[PDB]
Amino acid sequence: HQLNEIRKKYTMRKSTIETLREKLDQLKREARKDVSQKIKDIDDQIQQ
Amino acid sequence: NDNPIPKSVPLHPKSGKYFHNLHARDLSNIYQQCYKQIDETINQLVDSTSP
């Protein structure tokens, strides 16, 4: 069971990298959305 | 004629002081400032717009 727990720790490391990948995906999505909104707002302010 | 108000009189030295004092308002500084402002506004506009 300790060896199985070590395999579970490896799977948990894979879960942590999956959590990292989902966090990177959400971070990139929020970052692109905010940067696009900010660029549009800055362009609108510059046009005004 | 009638009321003694002549249409015009010869210039006097006291009148000459006011004639010398009278001048057109000078706008050369204002025109230079307006030209500088419009030129700098054009320069700012050149890179202001998003590419």
Nearest to A26 by CA among A36, A34, A15, A38: A34
Residue with tokens 């307006």: B34
Task: Tell me how many degrees the CA angle A6-A7-A12 measures, rounded to the nearest 5.
Answer: 90
Q: How many CA atoms lie within 13 A of B46 on its CB side?
A: 5
B50 touches chain A (CB under 8 A): yes
Total number of residues shown for chain A: 48
User: Which is nearest to B19 in space by CA: B11, B30, B7?
Assistant: B11
In 3D space, the residue among A4, A21, A44, A19 whose CA is nearest the CA of residue B50 turns out to be A44
This structure was determined by cryo-EM
From chain A residues 14-43, the ones with a CB under 8 A of any chain B CB are 43
Residue with tokens 């717009």: B49
Answer whether B48's CB lies under 8 Å from A46's CB: yes
What is d(CA B42, CA B45) in angstroms, rounded to the nearest whole number?
Answer: 5
**Beta carbon pairs, A and B, within 8 Å:** 4
Give residues with Cβ within 8 angstroms of B11, minimum separation 6: B19
- Residue B23 backbone dihedrals phi, psi, to 5 degrees: -155, 160
Q: Please, what is the Cα angle at B45 between B40 and B48, to 5 degrees?
A: 125
Asked whether the beta carbons of residue A43 and residue B50 sit closer than 8 angstroms, the reply is yes
